[PDB]
Amino acid sequence: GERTIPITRE
Amino acid sequence: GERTIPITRE
Amino acid sequence: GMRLEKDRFSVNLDVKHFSPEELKVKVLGDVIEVHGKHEERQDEHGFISREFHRKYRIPADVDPLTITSSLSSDGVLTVNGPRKQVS
Amino acid sequence: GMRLEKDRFSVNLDVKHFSPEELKVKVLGDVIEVHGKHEERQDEHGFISREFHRKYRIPADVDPLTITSSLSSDGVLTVNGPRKQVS
Structure with missing residues (x-):
């Protein structure tokens, strides 16, 4: 039940 | 038993 | 407040x-x-x-020079000033 | 941590x-x-x-592109990535 936290790659 | 907090006037 | x-x-x-x-x-x-x-x-x-930042207006019948402040042991900050009263 | x-x-x-x-x-x-x-x-x-700011070094045997992140209901943020292992 986790929310995905998007990775910033710039 | 309070500590005086000095006022800044500039 | x-x-x-x-x-x-x-x-x-x-x-x-x-x-x-x-x-x-x-x-x-x-x-x-x-x-x-x-x-x-x-x-x-x-x-x-x-951090925090607060701003307040002092009423016209409080001389700003009479404002003072103190901090209690439990971490409450008080700022106060008297208003002009009848003598 | x-x-x-x-x-x-x-x-x-x-x-x-x-x-x-x-x-x-x-x-x-x-x-x-x-x-x-x-x-x-x-x-x-x-x-x-x-606010907070944290920085960490990724070990050389973790491909940075494999790092992902998720946030739990109770407010714990997890960032993780696999290390290369024997096959």
Whole structure:
């Protein structure tokens, strides 16, 4: 039940 | 038993 | 918060996370500002910061020069000044 | 905090005071940064802010492109990546 936290790659 | 907090006037 | 009363202006704020040196109470003209900033370099990897900034208007019947402030043991900051009263 | 283990790198942080939109997990080269900032304009008189910034080194046997992150219901942020293992 986790929310995905998007990775910033710039 | 309070500590005086000095006022800044500039 | 701010409380205007019949015979005084006062502001009471929770500042328990700030040391006295991390607080500023500025009175300039008829404006009071209260500021606090606390930073911790917990470790090699980073830090945390917290801060606040508040501004209030002093009523015209309070001489700003009479505003003073004190900090209680439990971390409540009081700023207050008397209002002109009948003699 | 950071935990390097035999088969994964992971970072677990308390971020309960931050919404997902207030968090940033940056992976560039072999560096991970985690940032959060939360401000409240409580009222007419001011605001409070809090923030944090953390930086960690990714071990050479973790491909940075394999790093991902998730946030639990109770406000723990996990950042993790697998290490190369024998097949």
